[PDB]
Copies of this chain bind each other. A is one copy, B any other.
Amino acid sequence: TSPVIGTPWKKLNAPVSEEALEGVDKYWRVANYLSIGQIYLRSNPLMKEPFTREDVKHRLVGHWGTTPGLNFLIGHINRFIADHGQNTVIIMGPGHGGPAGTSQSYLDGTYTETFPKITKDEAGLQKFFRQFSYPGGIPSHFAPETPGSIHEGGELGYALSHAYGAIMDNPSLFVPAIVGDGEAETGPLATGWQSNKLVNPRTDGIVLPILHLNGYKIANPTILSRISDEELHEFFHGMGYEPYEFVAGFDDEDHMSIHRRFAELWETIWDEICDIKATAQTDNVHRPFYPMLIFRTPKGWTCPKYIDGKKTEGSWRSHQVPLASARDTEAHFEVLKNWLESYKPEELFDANGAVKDDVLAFMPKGELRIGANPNANGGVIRNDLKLPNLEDYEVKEVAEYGHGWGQLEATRTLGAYTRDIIKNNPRDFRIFGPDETASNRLQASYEVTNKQWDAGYISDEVDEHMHVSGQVVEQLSEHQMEGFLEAYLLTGRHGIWSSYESFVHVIDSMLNQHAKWLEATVREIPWRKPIASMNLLVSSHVWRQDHNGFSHQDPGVTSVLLNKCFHNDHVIGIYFATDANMLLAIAEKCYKSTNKINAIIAGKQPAATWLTLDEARAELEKGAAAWDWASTAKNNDEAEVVLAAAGDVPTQEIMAASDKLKELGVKFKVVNVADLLSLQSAKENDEALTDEEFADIFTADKPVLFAYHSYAHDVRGLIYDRPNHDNFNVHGYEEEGSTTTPYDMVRVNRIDRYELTAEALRMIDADKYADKIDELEKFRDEAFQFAVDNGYDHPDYTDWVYSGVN
């Protein structure tokens, strides 16, 4: 449960004191000085004479175009938090403005507790300057290593979705989301603007989107800054926002006047926020107009105006680093020296190098600090879910009528399980889906909650199961759901989100970024506590896209996911749900897990059920297991072939092929691989099953016929080192598909039961079984011709049921 901190939504009811604004100005100066020292300095932080080119870093790496504006905003936000005691977490959308965040963490004090070696004196200042973007130091971007960070910012376009996710079910949290004007050009952010139609002011917090309209991208102006101001205000007001505009730094106005003006504007916007919050207590049915700030400043606002006769301040030339070589020429070093002295550090630092007390006297303290805020470190907030007992949802007909019984839809069991999880954990668990929950048969959750929808309502005939507050969020944008869920987990909550398989690639970048957030966390960041796992239910897979066809059949998500399994981080888990019971075991494991990305591939089509819950759990605790009941060989030596499968449709095809093989006297073994990553090399992955266990499951001499869900490429690239890998004959998706009957789909990919039977015969004796192979190959064509002639699959294919059903 998200905690309430301080006194949320209080109006100041007084003008901002002059001492507070003096503190803000001194903070801005000292923060800019630290941001410059990090990029350029390495030694002699206080410029004690002699200050020479020796003290400049050899390789100048970093960004400065956005840093001073971020320092300005952060200083004013710090004054605001100190005055009001608001629960605040800052989303820094331009993550390349890393020095701003690191400077804030150093100034508020949190960086010293987090890293004790960086003291608050001259030596600590020297280390702090040196370590930025340094070999063995800290990253340039606003990184997980930085206290008070929940958004990396490497990628662009996910600041707004992250802010809105952070405020969901968090009524007392205020999130100022700083957005780069160039970042606003990205596709994800343009639809993230429209995310105020899915949050309720009473049940959720408040997001204040601060558009950092500095004018330029890297070597390019931004579209937003160059269109007319009337167009900008009209555009923002068309998306349910009330635009306020602040303009500074474009003339010779004194800095203290700028601080006064921003104080007044900020207090006005805060008054509208408090009015919205107070209104939401009584009326929360009709959507308000959330204010948003348009912050127009020159890029690299405080840097020297001209360098080599080139306009630097207020241009794109200041994005990465002005003074690209301040160590190679004397004129550049003099420019840098004057730039550093312009902030007058002699009055900002005491004799010992500590920032003077009166500079930070206005700073917030305790839990209120951005660095120490719990919503930044979502691990400490996180509490484990209350999970319903699993046997309540087990499919018991398997244990009575035998394996392979029925035509159940696999995902409905997960739907019921998640419904009861929501029932036990309201306001703490949430389901996302890009318009596809009902298609993924997860609608069982609607019995205990509603779809959160804050746009207009028209009629009851079409608005079933929607409400202003709910635990289900839908919007046709995978970026929205991914960002929402990542932010939701990063703040300490839990959730799951489901999608079509081919469309998960839309968020291939996003997943990667989260993986990078986890890999960085597990390796070198002990103080960042574990967060809940990100659960992605991939459904409506390639093998059953009847209505859509070729455009919707892309199983390549696994190929992307495997790229992130290195160095025993275990941040990735890929699970294949053979049936409903296997799905239950997988989901239970995933919901108990932490610091992982769990992709559960389950089909929504009517499929048989093979395992009991105990059997499924036993298979899952190893990752792959031999089905003793399905096999005909009592020992490894007897088997003439091993049929291994991963995925529901491949499992069905393998079992159907096994039935035909059993009529021919073939001794074969049957293996099901629930978890893909268990097949990884033992010495590479300690959690992966050992080579001895692998050899026990797959005998060395016996050929192995593997039927796989995704492309065979990723499996073959995974088992290269394993014993008997050369005998594996993997059959996977082969980029063949259309709108056609289910038998045709598996036929054109050579994964059907008849082709699998012919393959298993060929690994034994093509010469002995030549006639049978000819008959099977003829029958494939005859069955396809039957589907063409009569419009549906063959009675042989459709009516087939396993011989073990009682």
Taking CB atoms and an 8 Å cut-off, the chain A residues in 311-328 that contact chain B are: 311, 314-316, 320
Q: A185-B475, A227-B455, A551-B155 are in contact. Are A315 and B462 (CB under 8 A)?
A: yes
Other-chain contact of A550, B57, B58, B139, B715 (Cβ < 8 Å): B139
Number of interface residues of A (CB under 8 A): 136
Q: Considering only CB atoms, which chain B residue lies closest to A741 in the complex? A: B135
Q: Quick check: A191 and B186 within 8 Å, CB to CB?
A: yes
Interface SS of chain A: loop
Determine which residue in A59, A143, A240, A715 has the highest number of CB atoms from chain B within 10 A of its CB, and name it.
A59
Instruction: Answer yes or no: A784 CB below 8 A from chain B CBs.
Output: yes
Q: Quick check: B59 and A741 within 8 Å, CB to CB?
A: yes
Q: A61-B547, A560-B508 are in contact. Are A462 and B194 (CB under 8 A)?
A: no
Instruction: Answer yes or no: A190 CB below 8 A from chain B CBs.
Output: yes
A73 cross-chain contacts in B, Cβ below 8 A: none
A222 cross-chain contacts in B, Cβ below 8 A: 476
How far does the alpha carbon of A720 sit from the alpha carbon of B720 in the complex, in Å? Answer: 8
Q: Quick check: B190 and A185 within 8 Å, CB to CB?
A: no
Taking CB atoms and an 8 Å cut-off, the chain A residues in 52-105 that contact chain B are: 57-59, 61-63, 95-96
Query: Could you give, for residues 111-154 of chain A, a 1 whenever the CB lies within 8 Å of some chain B CB and a 0 otherwise?
Result: 00000000000000000000001111111110100000000111
Instruction: Answer yes or no: A231 CB below 8 A from chain B CBs.
Output: yes
A139 cross-chain contacts in B, Cβ below 8 A: 549-551, 738-739
A162 → chain B closest CB, angstroms: 14
Q: Quick check: A223 and B455 within 8 Å, CB to CB?
A: yes
Q: Quick check: A226 and B462 within 8 Å, CB to CB?
A: no
Instruction: List the 5 closest pairs (A to B, CB-CB), nearest first.
Output: A154-B551, A235-B238, A717-B717, A190-B190, A234-B238
Q: List 6 A-B contacts (CB under 8 A).
A: A141-B549, A154-B551, A187-B477, A221-B455, A520-B550, A564-B735
A486 cross-chain contacts in B, Cβ below 8 A: none
Q: Quick check: A182 and B435 within 8 Å, CB to CB?
A: yes
Stretch at the interface among A511-519, A636-644, A770-778: A511-519
How far does the alpha carbon of A742 sit from the alpha carbon of B205 in the complex, in Å? Answer: 44
Other-chain contact of A157, B187, B720, B736 (Cβ < 8 Å): B187
Instruction: Answer yes or no: A12 CB below 8 A from chain B CBs.
Output: no
Other-chain contact of A182, B182, B457, B476, B478 (Cβ < 8 Å): B476
A451 cross-chain contacts in B, Cβ below 8 A: 220
Stretch at the interface among A261-269, A367-375, A786-794: A786-794
A462 cross-chain contacts in B, Cβ below 8 A: 216, 221, 311, 314-316
Q: Quick check: B455 and A226 within 8 Å, CB to CB?
A: yes
A556 cross-chain contacts in B, Cβ below 8 A: 512, 560, 563
Instruction: Answer yes or no: A695 CB below 8 A from chain B CBs.
Output: no
How many copies of the shown chain assemble into the complex?
Answer: 2
Q: Quick check: B734 and A476 within 8 Å, CB to CB?
A: no
Q: A140-B739, A713-B718 are in contact. Are A156 and B476 (CB under 8 A)?
A: yes
Query: Could you give, for residues 237-279 of chain A, a 1 whenever the CB lies within 8 Å of some chain B CB and a 0 otherwise?
Result: 1111000000000000000000000000000000000000000
Instruction: Answer yes or no: A430 CB below 8 A from chain B CBs.
Output: no
Q: Considering only CB atoms, which chain B residue lies closest to A738 in the complex? A: B139
How far does the alpha carbon of A734 sit from the alpha carbon of B474 in the complex, in Å? Answer: 36
Instruction: Answer yes or no: A503 CB below 8 A from chain B CBs.
Output: yes
How far does the alpha carbon of A233 sit from the alpha carbon of B238 in the complex, in Å? Answer: 7
A223 → chain B closest CB, angstroms: 5
Other-chain contact of A234, B62, B237, B476 (Cβ < 8 Å): B237
Q: Considering only CB atoms, which chain B residue lies closest to A287 in the complex? A: B227
Q: Quick check: B735 and A141 within 8 Å, CB to CB?
A: no
Q: Considering only CB atoms, which chain B residue lies closest to A712 in the complex? A: B717
Q: Quick check: A456 and B226 within 8 Å, CB to CB?
A: yes
Determine which residue in A63, A311, A791 has the highest number of CB atoms from chain B within 10 A of its CB, and name it.
A791
Query: Could you give, for residues 152-184 of chain A, a 1 whenever the CB lies within 8 Å of some chain B CB and a 0 otherwise?
Result: 111111000000000000000000000000110
Instruction: Answer yes or no: A438 CB below 8 A from chain B CBs.
Output: yes
A237 cross-chain contacts in B, Cβ below 8 A: 231, 234, 238
Instruction: Answer yes or no: A567 CB below 8 A from chain B CBs.
Output: yes
A14 cross-chain contacts in B, Cβ below 8 A: none
How far does the alpha carbon of A563 sit from the alpha carbon of B462 in the complex, in Å? Answer: 41
A39 → chain B closest CB, angstroms: 11
Other-chain contact of A717, B140, B519, B549, B714 (Cβ < 8 Å): B714
How far does the alpha carbon of A436 sit from the alpha carbon of B455 in the complex, in Å? Answer: 38
Q: Considering only CB atoms, which chain B residue lies closest to A190 in the complex? A: B190
Query: Could you give, for residues 535-578 of chain A, a 1 whenever the CB lies within 8 Å of some chain B CB and a 0 otherwise?
Result: 00000000000111111101010011011101100000000000
How far does the alpha carbon of A11 sit from the alpha carbon of B343 in the complex, in Å? Answer: 64
Determine which residue in A61, A183, A435, A456 has the highest number of CB atoms from chain B within 10 A of its CB, and name it.
A435
Q: A182-B476, A315-B461, A436-B218 are in contact. Are A95 and B551 (CB under 8 A)?
A: yes
Instruction: Answer yes or no: A439 CB below 8 A from chain B CBs.
Output: yes
Taking CB atoms and an 8 Å cut-off, the chain A residues in 323-372 that contact chain B are: none
A593 → chain B closest CB, angstroms: 20
Taking CB atoms and an 8 Å cut-off, the chain A residues in 437-476 that contact chain B are: 438-439, 451, 453, 455-459, 461-463, 474-476
Q: A190-B194, A217-B435, A231-B240 are in contact. Are A791 and B713 (CB under 8 A)?
A: no
